[PDB]
Amino acid sequence: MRHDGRQHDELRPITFDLDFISHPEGSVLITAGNTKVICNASVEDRVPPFLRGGGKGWITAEYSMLPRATNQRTIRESSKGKISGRTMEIQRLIGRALRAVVDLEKLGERTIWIDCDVIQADGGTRTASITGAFLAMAIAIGKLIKAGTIKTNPITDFLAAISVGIDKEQGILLDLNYEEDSSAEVDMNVIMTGSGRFVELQGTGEEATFSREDLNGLLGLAEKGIQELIDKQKEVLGDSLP
Amino acid sequence: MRHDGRQHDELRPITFDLDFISHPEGSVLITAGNTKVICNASVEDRVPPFLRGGGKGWITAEYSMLPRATNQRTIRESSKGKISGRTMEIQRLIGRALRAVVDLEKLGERTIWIDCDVIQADGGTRTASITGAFLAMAIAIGKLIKAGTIKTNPITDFLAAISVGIDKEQGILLDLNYEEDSSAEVDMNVIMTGSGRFVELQGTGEEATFSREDLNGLLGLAEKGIQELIDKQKEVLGDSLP
Amino acid sequence: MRHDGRQHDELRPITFDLDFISHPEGSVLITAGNTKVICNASVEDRVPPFLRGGGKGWITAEYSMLPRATNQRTIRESSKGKISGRTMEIQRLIGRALRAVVDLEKLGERTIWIDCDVIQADGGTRTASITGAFLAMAIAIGKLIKAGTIKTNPITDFLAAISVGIDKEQGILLDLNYEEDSSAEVDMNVIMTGSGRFVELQGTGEEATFSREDLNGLLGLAEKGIQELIDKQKEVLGDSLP
Amino acid sequence: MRHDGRQHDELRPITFDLDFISHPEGSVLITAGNTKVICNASVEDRVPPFLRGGGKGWITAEYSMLPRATNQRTIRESSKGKISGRTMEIQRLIGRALRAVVDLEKLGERTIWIDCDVIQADGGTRTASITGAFLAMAIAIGKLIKAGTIKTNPITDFLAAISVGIDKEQGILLDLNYEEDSSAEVDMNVIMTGSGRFVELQGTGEEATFSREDLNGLLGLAEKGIQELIDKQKEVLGDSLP
Amino acid sequence: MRHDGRQHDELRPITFDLDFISHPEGSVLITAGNTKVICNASVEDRVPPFLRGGGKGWITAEYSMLPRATNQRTIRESSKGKISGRTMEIQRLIGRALRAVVDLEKLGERTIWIDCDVIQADGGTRTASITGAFLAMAIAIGKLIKAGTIKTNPITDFLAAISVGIDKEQGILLDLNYEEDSSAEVDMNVIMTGSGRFVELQGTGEEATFSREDLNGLLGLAEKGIQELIDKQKEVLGDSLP
Amino acid sequence: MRHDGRQHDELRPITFDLDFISHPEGSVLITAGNTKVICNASVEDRVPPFLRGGGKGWITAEYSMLPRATNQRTIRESSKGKISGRTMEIQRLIGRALRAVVDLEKLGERTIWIDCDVIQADGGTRTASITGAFLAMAIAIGKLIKAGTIKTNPITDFLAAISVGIDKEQGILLDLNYEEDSSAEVDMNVIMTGSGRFVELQGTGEEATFSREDLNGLLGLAEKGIQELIDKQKEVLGDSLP
């Protein structure tokens, strides 16, 4: 059916290499098929202008794609006097997402920096980033508990995301890759929690348009994949967090 | 209930001033409550690099917000050596949307430029722009038919959009304004066709998160509003297009 | 004689729509023939680096021309990594002009932002902008008096401007439009006060060159038109300012 | 009367060092009192987008002021992510001016680059630049004739400029310097041809305003000075151009 | 002695993970202590303007440092409208270096892109990059031979680099890290070949200054370390290149 | 032997015109053969962020090359939205160098701005700049002593630099020019003090590579030239500094 040889509702092989990079408090290298992203979580007692003594913590994220992470070498973002739209659109998405499952108050007035740097791109880097950004943030926060830097665990749920779409001649597809995301008529990112609720939904029909029926199809497929992801997420994380 | 004094499922008053600006082939000034956007459609026999002799036409759009279109004067985008993220995120959305209802082949190898410049902002400028950008594009194409510059009408459907959201203490709301969009927990733009199908769906829960139930609520409300919009769209357009 | 069907010393029809845009303290939509400019005045207690506690106020202005405001769609200035020369040359002119008739000391240490955004261009947008920028600034300051935010009226005179030129086969022309400004041998912007004095004079002979005689001809014509403008300016403003 | 010890209608001492810098086709170091500008003319067979095969040549100019060319060290323009307004306003003025006395057609489809870099500033750098930019351009074109790269001499006249103004307690002054231009009520740049015609007139009353009488005064003084300049211009240029 | 617990002439532990990233023809992840750099080599039949049909190949390189690769999160280079000096200074160094050991003629008219992206920085990233950039380039070229895309092996030698310096109270140090490079009086990068010759020497005494004696000390130490590096380089590369 | 007709170990004729430009505290026009650089030193009681009340002074430098300072007109750096690499690489070098011979503490909490603007380039502009930048800085500081603005002389040594290299068929060459630096196999800048110590060493073998023997050759030649430079430096400076 599909050129990977996977069923329409099958995720790509996932691997989670923990503590990939020494320095960061939380570091995970998520591999989803050929998509590889380095997710690092860094803590730092400090907050932007509007959180002064608010006893509320923050979570921001930066996302980049190495020039030859893609099939064709894309111009380094630094070369251009500005950060591209995608990077912009994506960085906010990752931060917005992670915050939805963390008690910013219980975290303290500290700030968590999430750096998602894609070293190999083959579709679904946006979502793959969120999935691994969580694990990393968890580990960073998990070991923040140990050293007694916070008394309670701020994480109020598991988080994960996955792309899904419709291919003119194959229908619904779970977890697209560059090939698929490139020719699909309806691209669609879905981000949920362990408790099966939605954090964010972003669907766009570039070629054609979808119906209430199509939608419910994609949502159902995505939900299935995300649960599959959160499981793998639970075993791996295991002890790092109570 | 709401400070406009409108019901939970009532649109703001809409007005369509046609031919607002002489010069452009298509020009419409859409007014949605206090939101006012100037939508101009310009034709131009030419295409980007990848449409050379492809017999395929294009549709691109640029969106700007005059500095004091907002309650607080925002720095002119030109002043900054770069175009902001929103503008970026929005310009693509408008173009992507319009293309979903136009047979780029039947249009020819010409290019349609859509300029949506907001002169007064009070919420839902993104959607209001798409709604009026259509009308303008229709008129431009409509009169392109007359002069026999194309033999068949490329427009394959009507297009419109509308914001919808959830207010902590009021629930579902159709067509938010700046105050509402500002305090809503779940923002959500919806773009559909006359045939009741989806072109794009963008929903984000900044404060909290939504459920499959909430979603189906919003979608249902949006759908209702959009149909209401396409009607007004049909009478006004009337003859300009066959 | 002239295609508008107007005499060499006749101004184009002028209209002043006050309070066009809700948000700004001062907002005027000046229409001069087919030239339409949105002039907004915004107050803001603050000053650049060199006015710290100087008890002196400031007045700066930004000018833009919507992409399809012109007969041919010009590339959006934001698209280019820089602001064009004209815009530059013009923004400074408007600010310089307005300041020449305002007691920056009596104004206070606040700052007035003038945004002149041309929505339809057909010649003399530079001057039309100044003419309307004044009215807007007047209204903003006028209502700044009421609320007792300043004790005395800073405006020390009326201000207005108008283009004038020489056409190879028609001679002196008052208030050119795109067609005329385009083929005239001698373009020339003139900015004066109610008291009949000059604030700025900018004359350039692109094709040929002019003589002391020609000059005195243009200046005399311009002066006539400007007085005509300041009258219309007086009735309209009327009460908004003491 | 004046600190320099010069009469109201006396120019500052002028010197023209030809071929100052080896590399450029035309190079002149103009010294006007304490104002020193390096004017270089560079030829280059090529034209911008709109002169392709038009058989029409171009003339553009860039102007800069070395950081400590002024009494106080001004921030390098490169340091700022943008070119200042003055530089902008001035670069265009120089190019516009030179073009007014050159048959762009007879020049060919080549392009002349004029670089006016001020190494010591003490007033009237804008005008001094034009005066010397001409000489340089003349020499470049003059020796372009010799090598038979063009058959006819494109220069259709001599060009020069000079500042003039009014001092509250001294009246009309010819060729101001930094201290005079700084306290004058009416600044005013005048650019003319050998044939005594005007190319550009730029007058501004910052403090006060001027009358038709004042104007005719300044114009008359400027004209006198410019003729004086074109003479010095004729002997020096001498043979370099037929 | 030193905080790593290593002798003054001991290198940090080095590891070479080959084929780290699938996509690039050559991909190596060099780890030097805590410094980790992803070195990717990409081939591409094409050359800049001045190598058209010259039968000469090229080698260019881009270098970046992920925002939180450093102990403190540095602003993304893309965020700034420009690429920093270091990046500039470094990118050229890497390219210049690699070219010194490759017969650009035997390579063909193709172009090799080297992307050195540092994912974890702890000193000597500049040099570590060159050392790994070679290995990657070797592999890319090595497998270019196999597929018979070139008949002869262009690499004319092995290349490697290493930092060295002087610490106020410890003397000569081989292979500094962030801590050491930060407090050393004399920083100094050295790049040599297998044949023990110099390709580039860059030494700078920020605090103090060095003597002919000091220099010969550093050079001798560096040379020792580099040879050590080229060995590890030989075994790892092993067969990938004849 | 060499086109100039100078021996392999002969410097180009050097001239030092003091007080070239009135305004700056220190101003020197260094001429090395055909290379001409304007070196200006400007004092300014103030320091960047990290020197607040530190009683430590600073020294920064900016370097530019006028567009037609070179044989071919290079694009103005301002035209490009960024400062080139060379300029970057060089500006830092000059500042770094000068600081190595000045007791920043004895200087005070003031800041010295060095502007090296090349008006005619023919090789060795980088070094020529440092050589003259010193003289200028000396004079600025020298006359800072007189007016008793500082009690002790901060300059702890003389500074100078010179390029040196190897020509495929001529060997070692002292003080290259554009032609020589262009075809040399080994370029190499050397910066030393009067006390014969090294401040910075930058050597690069673009074509080939050099050996310990070659190196010691160049270093020995450079050292010879630099001493020759510091002498000329001593007489000229003479009294300006104790």
From Swiss-Prot, chains A, B, C, D, E, F:
Q: Which UniProt keywords apply?
A: Nucleotidyltransferase, RNA-binding, rRNA processing, Transferase, tRNA processing, tRNA-binding
Which Gene3D superfamilies does the UniProt record give? GHMP Kinase, N-terminal domain
PROSITE patterns assigned: RIBONUCLEASE_PH (PS01277)
Catalytic activity field: tRNA(n+1) + phosphate = tRNA(n) + a ribonucleoside 5'-diphosphate
Q: Extract the SUPFAM superfamilies matched here.
A: Ribonuclease PH domain 2-like, Ribosomal protein S5 domain 2-like
Q: What is its EC number?
A: 2.7.7.56
Its subunit composition reads: Homohexameric ring arranged as a trimer of dimers. It has been suggested that the active form is the dimer which binds tRNA and that the hexameric form protects the substrate recognition loop (approximately residues 65-82) from proteolysis.
Miscellaneous comment in the UniProt entry for this protein: Sulfate ions in the crystal structure may represent the inorganic phosphate substrate.
Function according to Swiss-Prot or TrEMBL: Phosphorolytic 3'-5' exoribonuclease that plays an important role in tRNA 3'-end maturation. Removes nucleotide residues following the 3'-CCA terminus of tRNAs; can also add nucleotides to the ends of RNA molecules by using nucleoside diphosphates as substrates, but this may not be physiologically important. Probably plays a role in initiation of 16S rRNA degradation (leading to ribosome degradation) during starvation. Plays a role in the secondary pathway of 23S rRNA 3' end maturation.
Q: Which family does it belong to?
A: Belongs to the RNase PH family.
- What's the protein here called? Ribonuclease PH
The scientific name of the source species is Bacillus subtilis (strain 168)
Q: Which gene encodes it?
A: rph
